[PDB]
Symmetry: D2
Subunit: 272 residues, 4 copies
């Protein structure tokens, strides 16, 4: 049993290879800000030796009001990424919500994404199936890990066969998430050992971001999917929970001494 590869460009994403960080930012507030954000990761990434992918959203179809900030917009959002790629030389992972946005973003970026809440939207997956560009299937809170196969199959059946599975904890009572650490493994199986990643800042909806991201790494994953803001305290709105920018590096050393020190272990078996 070997691991699978859904490599994006010069990058190879696989459970036995070193972890690839799909960090970044939540919503695209403004290039002035964005870029500054895309700036630290890159520096810390290259400086620490960790594959990178920048993430940012150009739209928030979901919120608690219409009289709020949708986002940069699909048309005005794609552009914004452009200016970024060239400037820094990193890929762009963003999420789609309409069968239209499908192809566009396919040209503008590298790693597209499927929102959890839509993981079971035939029409939209049969459309993302076209692009043939790497896909990220965020795992819905209300869905058992062993159900990740059907979603992966359907992607195959549509033409695309390069998919990734991101974990964001699972419902635990009302208004609460807990990350079954045994999930990741069960998820490897049903998808054909496809790439598995942990969306930590999202499994938290805190000082916990560290300790909680540490555990997931010591199990062996194809990487993380994080978010950080320069001033978390104030921008402190809702949805996920971002990281304290400055603390990016010292935090990322925590992972390597894991993502490396564990991605090079002599396969064990507490089975037989």
């Amino acid at each position: 049993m070997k691991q699978k590869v859904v490599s994006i460009g010069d990058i190879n994403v696989a459970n036995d290879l070193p972890f690839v960080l799909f960090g970044g930012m939540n919503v695209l507030e403004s290039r002035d800000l964005a870029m500054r954000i895309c700036e630290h990761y890159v520096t810390v990434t290259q400086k620490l030796g960790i594959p990178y992918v920048f993430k940012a959203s150009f739209d928030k179809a979901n919120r608690s009001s219409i009289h709020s900030y949708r986002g940069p917009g699909l048309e005005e959002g794609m552009k914004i990424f452009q200016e970024l790629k060239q400037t820094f030389g990193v890929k762009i992972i963003t999420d789609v919500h309409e069968p239209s946005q499908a192809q566009p973003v396919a040209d503008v970026v590298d790693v597209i994404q499927l929102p959890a809440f839509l993981a079971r939207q035939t029409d939209l997956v049969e459309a993302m199936a076209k692009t043939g560009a790497v896909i990220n299937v965020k795992k819905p809170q209300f869905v058992s890990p062993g159900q990740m196969g059907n979603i992966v199959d359907k992607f195959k059946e549509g033409g695309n066969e390069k998919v990734i599975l991101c974990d964001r904890g699972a419902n635990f009572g009302y208004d609460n998430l807990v990350v079954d650490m045994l999930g990741f493994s069960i998820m490897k199986k049903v998808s054909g050992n496809s790439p598995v990643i942990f969306d930590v800042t999202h499994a938290l909806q805190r000082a916990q971001v560290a300790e909680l991201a540490r555990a997931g790494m010591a199990v062996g994953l194809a990487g993380l999917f994080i978010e950080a803001h320069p001033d978390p305290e104030h921008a402190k709105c809702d949805g996920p929970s971002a990281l304290p920018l400055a603390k990016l590096e010292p935090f990322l050393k925590q992972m390597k001494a894991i993502d490396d020190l564990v991605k090079g272990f002599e396969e064990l078996d507490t089975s037989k």
Copy 2:
């Protein structure tokens, strides 16, 4: 504290009024079948004295494969309802999945609906907001009842102020649903005592359909939302779980001796 009314035509839906059945069928297989289905309810309804609304889907955006039956289609689906209304004189409740389908169905039917998985899709709610036609907000399995206000507010903010809340149990471990009977009440509150209904066949994903629908009724609801098939055993596919048609009537007597015998109780208070 009085109850609210989101009456559809000659029908009044409210927590203190008798229960209104939003029964029907899942997907629209064929008028030959549909109608036969729409036939028994109507007979049993009128014969037993229970308000009625027929439900049927014209599309299943969600499934486990593209190489399967989407459904009658929006354009070819709406028509099918037409032929029904006149023939029997009952309203039509169906669900939408696209901001387009919004207005169309608004003319063709009476009770439109919001799928759970989309309960938090701004754009699509701001669109359903237009129609101004009664709305049904299926409560997502992964969402606490006290969160039903924001969804109800947003509907107001968009213009529509006639909304209903349907309950379908809440996640309990992996691959399992349990219906918090205390939900219904908590749901009345946050929405401004809006109409609350139980989607039983869906809270089950069995001989349990009865016993489980009984409990919900003895708490006092603005009604149920059921489904039945003439040959459940064979058509035994997945998604919800339908009822055994024939058993419609004797089953519905179970509710009345509740929906009535409890909808006429001297308000109690185990509070003070």
Copy 3:
């Protein structure tokens, strides 16, 4: 398939027979109080026509401090019941925590009981097995209903074969209970259709006591197990949640129009 009977004296407890209330009080504060409590039930019981059993604890092995009120004590507690039986002519259901208390209480009362937390204490069940006096197995929050057989078997194997199963909801996240209404049925099965009862005030750990106890009754049970205090608001300590004494009667009319109106239904089957 017929129901089983674990009748205590002139009382017959069974799922198809009318519900038997095992109400009463939590801890035995004082006869002056106790009795007053035992007074209203009895009056309302006889006045409404509902079998009765009074419940009260003579010890609270579990609490949040040693420097607190253990309880009347086993030796000084048993006596207290005596004075009650004669005065009112109702049985006494109390819980045990030691293999010693086993036999004593067996002579002093009618319905002994097994605490949930101990449902799996061999030695203590093999001891309660002796008494041969009716037993009540409170169902632990952390145990699936289908596991209630083993506990019932062991009771048989020990000699006793008259056991009852009380339901108190099941863990739902941290610090929260939800009552799977489908539990009761699943519990009937594995125990050999033994008697099933709902411990409502305990499934709540409120104005909810009513609405929540209504649901359970409309499913058909061998009765309830409640608690009420004359001044809930103040005595408002913790553990279960008692009922507002005065409100006993008007509340109990709610049940009959259910426990009766449903205990006389023409067996249905949404199965075939």
Copy 4:
């Protein structure tokens, strides 16, 4: 904020110190076997440089039948440990179920223990309070981590102030456990930073023993609490889930490269 120490003899148990393994075996089948078990740990422990404590039960008050193996017995069980201590020079951690067994075991062993199911048994804790010998509070599946203070307080109030908290996952639906990795931290707090340990073989009720024990270590704990059997496959009965003896060492290297490589990290803060 410094960590606390509840050191047993020449051993110091604390969250910031290296992890201490409280491994061993479940029930005491026989010295012939026991010892052989106590043999590998010791060898691997000393050989790998990891503090050790051997665990084994001398009684199983809980089971699924009386006509089964209780265990060596308290009187005949204590003795068995004796012969072990001298032979190998390691401490003995065993669990108690009666206020009597309290003091005895206090002389015979080093680390006594509180069973989860009894974590809230006043009388028995007020008794374990006497011994003044280190205590292990297994955290009940049905109890939130933030509730671990009251249990720790009561232990203080009784005289003993050297307590440890062992985590064994928390209920997740029916018949299932999931380990909230964020638990450990929350548990440190409420107990006064007391010692926290993970009971992995018990959080599993498999090949998962490894991956799952890895996560817990990368969060930083005062150690583990494991169990292994020479022939797991056959002795494959129930209760916890043991480890494959032989695989003890290569498995324990997994922990050190964590328990060490993380117990020597520059305190981070994703907080501010």
